[PDB]
Ligand binder design. Sequence first.
Ligand code: 7P9
Ligand code: 7P9
Ligand code: 7P9
Ligand code: 7P9
Ligand code: 7P9
Ligand code: 7P9
Ligand code: 7P9
Ligand code: 7P9
Ligand code: NAG
Ligand code: NAG
Ligand code: NAG
Ligand code: NAG
Ligand code: NAG
Ligand code: NAG
Ligand code: NAG
Ligand code: NAG
Ligand code: NAG
Ligand code: NAG
Ligand code: CL
Ligand code: CL
Lengths: 336, 336, 336, 336, 336
Amino acid sequence: KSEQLLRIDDHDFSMRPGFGGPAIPVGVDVQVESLDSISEVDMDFTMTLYLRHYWKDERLSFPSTNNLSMTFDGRLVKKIWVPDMFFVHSKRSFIHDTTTDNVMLRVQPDGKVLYSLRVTVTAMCNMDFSRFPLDTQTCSLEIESYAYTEDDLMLYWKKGNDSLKTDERISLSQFLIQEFHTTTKLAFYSSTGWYNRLYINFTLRRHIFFFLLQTYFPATLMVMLSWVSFWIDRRAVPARVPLGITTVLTMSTIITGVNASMPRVSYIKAVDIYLWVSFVFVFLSVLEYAAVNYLTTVQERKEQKLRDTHAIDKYSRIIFPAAYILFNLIYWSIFS
Amino acid sequence: KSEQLLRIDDHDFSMRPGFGGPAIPVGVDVQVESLDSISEVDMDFTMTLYLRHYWKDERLSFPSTNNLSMTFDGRLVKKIWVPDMFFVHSKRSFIHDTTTDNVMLRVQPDGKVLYSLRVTVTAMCNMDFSRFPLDTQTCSLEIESYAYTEDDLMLYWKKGNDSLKTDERISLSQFLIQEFHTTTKLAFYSSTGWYNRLYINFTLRRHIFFFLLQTYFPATLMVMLSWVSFWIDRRAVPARVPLGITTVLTMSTIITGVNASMPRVSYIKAVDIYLWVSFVFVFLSVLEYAAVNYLTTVQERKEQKLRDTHAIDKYSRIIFPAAYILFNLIYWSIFS
Amino acid sequence: KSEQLLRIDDHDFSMRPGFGGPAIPVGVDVQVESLDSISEVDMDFTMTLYLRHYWKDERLSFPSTNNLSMTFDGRLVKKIWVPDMFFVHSKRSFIHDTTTDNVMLRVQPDGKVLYSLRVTVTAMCNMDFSRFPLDTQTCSLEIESYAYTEDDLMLYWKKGNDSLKTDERISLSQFLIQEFHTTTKLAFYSSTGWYNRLYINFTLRRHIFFFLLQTYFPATLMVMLSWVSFWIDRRAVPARVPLGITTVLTMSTIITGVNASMPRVSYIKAVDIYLWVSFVFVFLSVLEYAAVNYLTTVQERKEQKLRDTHAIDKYSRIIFPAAYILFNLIYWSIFS
Amino acid sequence: KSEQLLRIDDHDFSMRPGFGGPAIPVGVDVQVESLDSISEVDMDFTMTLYLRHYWKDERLSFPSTNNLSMTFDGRLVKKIWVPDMFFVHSKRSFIHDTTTDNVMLRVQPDGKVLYSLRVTVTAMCNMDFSRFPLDTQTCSLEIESYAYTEDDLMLYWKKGNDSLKTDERISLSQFLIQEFHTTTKLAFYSSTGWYNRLYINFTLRRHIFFFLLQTYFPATLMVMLSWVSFWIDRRAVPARVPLGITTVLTMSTIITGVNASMPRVSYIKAVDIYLWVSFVFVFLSVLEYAAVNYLTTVQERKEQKLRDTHAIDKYSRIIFPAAYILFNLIYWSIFS
Amino acid sequence: KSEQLLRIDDHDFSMRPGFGGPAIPVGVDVQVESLDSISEVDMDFTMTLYLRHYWKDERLSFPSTNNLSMTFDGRLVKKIWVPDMFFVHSKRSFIHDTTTDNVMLRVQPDGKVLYSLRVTVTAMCNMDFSRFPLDTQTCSLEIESYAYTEDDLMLYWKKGNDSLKTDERISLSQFLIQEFHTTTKLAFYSSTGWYNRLYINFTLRRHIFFFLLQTYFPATLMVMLSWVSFWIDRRAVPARVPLGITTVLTMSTIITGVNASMPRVSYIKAVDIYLWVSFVFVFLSVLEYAAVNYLTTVQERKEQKLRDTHAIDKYSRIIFPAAYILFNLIYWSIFS
Ligand SMILES: CCCCCCCCC(=O)O[C@H](COC(=O)CCCCCC)COP(=O)(O)O
Ligand SMILES: CCCCCCCCC(=O)O[C@H](COC(=O)CCCCCC)COP(=O)(O)O
Ligand SMILES: CCCCCCCCC(=O)O[C@H](COC(=O)CCCCCC)COP(=O)(O)O
Ligand SMILES: CCCCCCCCC(=O)O[C@H](COC(=O)CCCCCC)COP(=O)(O)O
Ligand SMILES: CCCCCCCCC(=O)O[C@H](COC(=O)CCCCCC)COP(=O)(O)O
Ligand SMILES: CCCCCCCCC(=O)O[C@H](COC(=O)CCCCCC)COP(=O)(O)O
Ligand SMILES: CCCCCCCCC(=O)O[C@H](COC(=O)CCCCCC)COP(=O)(O)O
Ligand SMILES: CCCCCCCCC(=O)O[C@H](COC(=O)CCCCCC)COP(=O)(O)O
Ligand SMILES: *[C@@H]1O[C@H](CO)[C@@H](O)[C@H](O)[C@H]1NC(C)=O
Ligand SMILES: *[C@@H]1O[C@H](CO)[C@@H](O)[C@H](O)[C@H]1NC(C)=O
Ligand SMILES: *[C@@H]1O[C@H](CO)[C@@H](O)[C@H](O)[C@H]1NC(C)=O
Ligand SMILES: *[C@@H]1O[C@H](CO)[C@@H](O)[C@H](O)[C@H]1NC(C)=O
Ligand SMILES: *[C@@H]1O[C@H](CO)[C@@H](O)[C@H](O)[C@H]1NC(C)=O
Ligand SMILES: *[C@@H]1O[C@H](CO)[C@@H](O)[C@H](O)[C@H]1NC(C)=O
Ligand SMILES: *[C@@H]1O[C@H](CO)[C@@H](O)[C@H](O)[C@H]1NC(C)=O
Ligand SMILES: *[C@@H]1O[C@H](CO)[C@@H](O)[C@H](O)[C@H]1NC(C)=O
Ligand SMILES: *[C@@H]1O[C@H](CO)[C@@H](O)[C@H](O)[C@H]1NC(C)=O
Ligand SMILES: *[C@@H]1O[C@H](CO)[C@@H](O)[C@H](O)[C@H]1NC(C)=O
Ligand SMILES: [Cl-]
Ligand SMILES: [Cl-]
């Protein structure tokens, strides 16, 4: 029996190696397989990865006439000591078990142990949508020991920045993934003390041109279309009035459709500012012709009682485009 | 073997410590890690937290030449007595088990025991949306012993109000979280008797300006736009009629879009009152010109058979804005 | 050891108490904690409740010098006999297990046993939406023994109608819950014989005024608005025609929005009848002016070749409101 | 002990009864409790049912002084041989376990065994929506032995067509269920050989009148409304043009709303053909007046340079309704 | 006992057959039962299949007087060595267990072993929607040994390209499935070394005519309808202006409805290019009449101060259709 080469019953496997002495170093290597999905409303993402641990235990040394190693499955985990790593700020996770548990153990003759498992984890990531759709989001994944402090277990990246590997075909449907790197930081808990924590960082970006074409283009086109009425004769009321009211209706429908296709985030974003400024512009373009018509009627009635182009249109033709251009300059300087 | 230092087989671990005597005090400390999501339709929220228990058991005392403690994992839980806390008014919950069970046990030489576990719980919270979107909701989380009454187990916060800690980056997408505090209350069950219950309370608020801009602004703009027709000559029927009917259509589309983006709550809210009052105003603005046109036609026909501005417009120009301002004053005094 | 006071190994616990003799009575008490959700499309509801069983077993009697009882957790269930209750016409259910199994056992010195557990169950409930939104739905929850007939196990409510308790704050977002009561009925299975079944009944109702305001008000307003054209001069075709066609468009949009916000139930309801009758009314209001215009053109052409208000408008002004009022009377007499 | 009456340890229960001889007959009875839901997009349905097996085993015979039987729960399944039935072409299934496993075993003194369990199963069902909403779908449920061929296990319906029972109140929200019957067929696998398979068949139908009223009625009404313009004077351009363009807009909105409420099936159906033919009709009704207006302008200009009803309208008034009636006749003859 | 014919306790089943010598060949056969669903947003698909393994082990040989084999269920798996196959780039998977585990083992007298199980797996598949709806997607399923390299376990298709079988009625609601074939490729891992990987490839296609009719037809019809105004007299402003603005509104509504029914993929596709070019065309058709009207007014005013068809319309009638035809030619040459 292979388990009789390792004196399992001659040692206590409820304690860490080197109990009572210096802490044992444990190295961690991570390979990212894929990113499953990302949820903006709940602010989380799902990742599938390989987790590997490296440590040495003299109690597992066995004699041999060569340098061959022994490989064991997940059934030997319950009989030996293994590190109790867990993912910080996670919501749910599981280990794949088809067609059997995806756990592997390799033991060297001198006691070096490799422990590898395949896991899927969902972790939280706070996001800020104030600059949507020009926002940038940075999410991280954290790994920490649960019950062992820095005095008993020392956690580190085995090969520094080379310990993280990513798949060549990792991608997201609506996001761009970039800038993968690893960092470490010490965390303190008042109940037990200090812990070592490992981080995996990456950055997310959107496709700007899609949102520009879908949102900013129709609003600008409708605003420029609302300026057509300034070049129409003031005497054609049944042409000036329906044009303005239908432009208002079209802008309202465009705004509603754009809102219906965005994530349900309940605070003001830049796109909302742009759309409502456009709506205000169309509203003012309607009030302008209302005032022109009233003044024309008053003047005609006064002339009849006593017995060309209106200046308001001339000034509006210059003022409205200049105001819109100034607003666009300020907006795109603020939001880059 | 570490388990041979504790005389497990020499004691009965099916009974609580101090059986037959005074009740044993048990202290509870809670650290809130994050709030996962909140559902308005089903009236529940999801929270992830750390739960810690403190109690003393003389049966676990072991001799030692120093003051070092022993740490055990979840496998020792089944061999000793642990408190049976459960969450009241919960719908579903689970304990994380990646890469292993997130359960820790620490035993002091004098018998003091610390029992900590990481859990995710979904709990109910009744909500009232009558004052939406100016509503305020208070939700709580309750912890109680399942099988032990106050005569056998005494439950309390270990350090009073300092026993609750919250993460610095806890937030919700569409809500503001504030006013975390802890309270206790005794509960009675006729089947068994009195129990001690612990509470964790917090308050939720919305973003008012977003809803104001998205809902109240377009309705007010459309109502003010409907008053433009009072300044147009009564003789231009093909300009007065289409303007009113298109304003009605635009208001209807705005109301439908607003309803489509709100939670499916089937009772009357303040926003509905505002929108339908606006719809009634636009309807009356159409009936007014209908009456003016009919009266003008009647007068002209009578004059022809026998062979300026209509007073209704003059009175409407004053009455409609005054009525709308009065309605807004009353509404915003009632709903603050 | 507490389990050595009960002669577990001296008795066979695979058979019911009193085997070979009269059936053993078993009492059931239910406390409803909350209603989680209700699904109209799938016709089911979710409930969380406490289930308690009472029975006597002489094999569990133990000597004592006082009248104290012993409390055991879920681990003793597998060593003794317990009733095998199950929920009839259920889809899915589970027993909560955080932080441990929510199962309690209390044994009296004379052999009386109390068995309590906390369970969540999803059960079917057939619904009829013909009278929507004025429909009333009655749902029930059923409890029955699985393997024991009335000859071996007699099931009953322990305290009659007092055996059902409900939480003070039980509520639903879009429904009103009322009339909780308990009933019993005998059921027959040809494979095994008769069984005793217990019922928990309740009634659901909606909020009428919300649906009235959201649906019936806009349709009536649009129908009344379509009657405005009968008071406009027949000579203003560019005012009569666009008004009618835009009214038809507005009614169509209102009907589509109302349909988009209702549950996806694929058969005719009362609200559909109301909306389509309104649509037919607006259609006829357009055909009426078409006929008036054609007749006016024919008369003018005939007069020119040979070389006031049209009666159709006068009759329509009376006929249309009277027909609509009669339809409303009949509809609200049929649907109350 | 009841298990000592059956010589469990004196026989090998890893082999089927009658090993090495003729195959053992096994009878199956099924009672359908309810249909939970049906998914058109994923093409599957969910059913809850009772499954019963009948077979004889001489190794379970026990002496008795009467004719009473012994009932055992799910714990005896692991100690005896039971048939390994499974559902073919299923996606997911489970056995209910509240408050315990819903498994029953009854053993007669002569060795007859009844094995009953309650199960919920989701099975695939290919559907064809070409004739939607006049389509008819037939779904089936299949039961087969997993590891035993016809040479070792003979599977059949115990009582022929009487072995299937259905609940009196089984129904679906949007479907009609009818024609339940049972059939058998032999299946061949090249790896192992022939198997016996059992079928449960039923048919699904929709509610025709609901879809007719919701879809075909508005399209026909709009098409008939588009013919009104042929009776209006050609000299009223501001009445002819807006009517046609608004009719086109209304038809487009109706088509979009109808598409938004149908299942997301990506191929052409009959309703799409009807709606797009109607759209083409309205388009042609607009081109007709465009041509009439151009011809009238040309004629007037020619007459002025040189110095009644247009025939196109007269022919259109007859041609358009006749063409639409012919199309409806052909369509309803093809699609019945 | 059947398990006593196989000397289970006389051999170590923790090591592979032929340990220390040449690698053991293992053959794999796959039968695809159905495709459950496909998700475009998350880029994955679900498949149900049968997995079979073939290998020889001399340690399982048993004496017999004939050539009959022994069949064992899933309970023997834990006592013998079985290959540890797993699915690469999968997200979740499970093995069906109703009414029992769907695992079968057949052992020949000479030691040949057949191991078959029924599994459901969800796997990732990167997709590109740039050419939507004319895109073609190729997805694959990968099988690899977890812990054994090519030096210890040699994995191959048992019968080459005949080892893959597919159901006759496999289909998808919105996709066409074709070109099933099998390939192999060697993969390298720096931690352990080389592995053998098996592939199952297939291709997906859409229904072109449905998307054409739903999207390209209405846009072309609206663009052609916008050219009607070039044939209308320039003196009818209340007919030219509302037609153009309503055409713009109709195009906007069509674009919004089309966007609302497509998968939420956030980058530019071909259909978007087509729709926005059409929108630009309608915008230019409105600017053209604006310019014509302004020029006509200027000319009339100049003539009055001093005291036929406009050329712009004549040139537009030719230029606009030619430009649209050229754009369609270029677009359909680029996108085929
Ligand atoms: C947005 C709607 C503005 C309403 C018109 C403002 C009332 C001023 C008015 O009518 O008095 C005008 C004064 O004209 C101007 O002030 C020219 C500047 C135009 C500003 C418009 C951008 C009376 O006209 P008149 O005495 O003939 O010059
Ligand atoms: C909302 C629609 C109201 C319909 C018009 C009311 C009919 C009264 C009418 O026409 O008689 C009017 C009386 O005018 C008034 O009462 C002035 C007050 C205006 C109230 C309007 C806010 C007849 O006109 P006249 O005899 O010339 O003054
Ligand atoms: C105008 C002054 C402000 C009104 C305050 C409304 C408070 C009344 C209230 O909250 O009880 C409301 C009733 O609301 C209304 O009466 C709607 C009025 C319709 C207006 C447009 C047609 C309770 O109704 P409900 O919860 O559905 O039982
Ligand atoms: C819904 C559309 C009805 C179309 C008009 C009906 C054609 C009858 C017609 O034009 O002949 C009319 C007869 O008028 C009437 O019958 C008065 C009753 C009005 C009924 C309308 C509710 C011819 O007009 P005349 O000979 O001048 O009276
Ligand atoms: C769908 C739009 C059809 C455009 C008009 C067709 C051009 C033919 C034309 O204008 O020449 C017409 C010929 O009229 C006809 O052909 C009568 C049949 C009407 C067919 C309409 C259904 C010229 O008018 P005229 O020489 O006065 O008869
Ligand atoms: C008018 C007479 C009735 C037509 C019967 C259509 C049967 C043809 C059929 O089912 O094959 C259909 C083709 O349908 C059409 O041709 C649509 C015509 C467009 C009309 C409006 C533009 C098969 O198409 P598909 O399943 O997408 O491959
Ligand atoms: C898309 C909107 C184009 C605006 C009109 C362009 C201004 C040019 C203008 O008005 O000067 C025109 C010149 O006409 C032309 O250039 C004929 C070509 C028409 C090109 C239109 C496709 C002045 O008119 P006229 O001196 O009488 O010829
Ligand atoms: C007219 C001739 C056909 C155009 C072929 C477009 C191919 C270019 C391409 O695929 O790269 C596209 C760019 O598409 C456009 O330029 C949109 C043009 C807007 C037109 C309406 C405003 C890549 O863009 P993206 O994936 O978002 O980085
Ligand atoms: C390799 O194994 C041989 C035994 O076969 C041993 O003598 C030698 O020292 C080993 N070398 C290393 C580097 O482990
Ligand atoms: C790892 O590489 C990243 C790449 O930017 C760098 O920021 C980081 O400092 C590096 N860390 C170490 C420990 O080398
Ligand atoms: C600490 O441990 C020492 C033994 O090393 C013991 O003598 C001393 O009393 C302990 N002190 C406390 C406060 O426990
Ligand atoms: C805890 O602090 C909260 C803060 O408002 C207070 O309301 C509550 O009374 C305090 N309770 C105790 C026990 O101090
Ligand atoms: C209560 O317990 C006492 C023993 O302490 C016993 O003598 C007495 O009979 C009991 N009474 C009842 C009602 O059980
Ligand atoms: C229980 O109370 C309800 C209340 O209406 C009543 O209908 C029912 O008959 C009662 N049943 C019994 C057994 O008292
Ligand atoms: C019924 O049981 C009696 C014993 O009580 C036995 O004598 C008789 O044969 C049995 N009959 C049948 C039909 O099993
Ligand atoms: C069972 O009844 C159905 C009812 O139509 C029939 O079609 C079928 O042939 C019958 N089968 C047998 C075996 O009687
Ligand atoms: C078949 O079995 C017989 C024993 O019944 C044996 O003699 C013969 O060799 C076997 N043949 C093969 C091909 O295994
Ligand atoms: C299997 O058949 C496919 C069919 O196209 C072919 O492409 C492939 O090369 C074949 N592979 C082998 C190993 O025959
Ligand atoms: Cl006009
Ligand atoms: Cl619209």
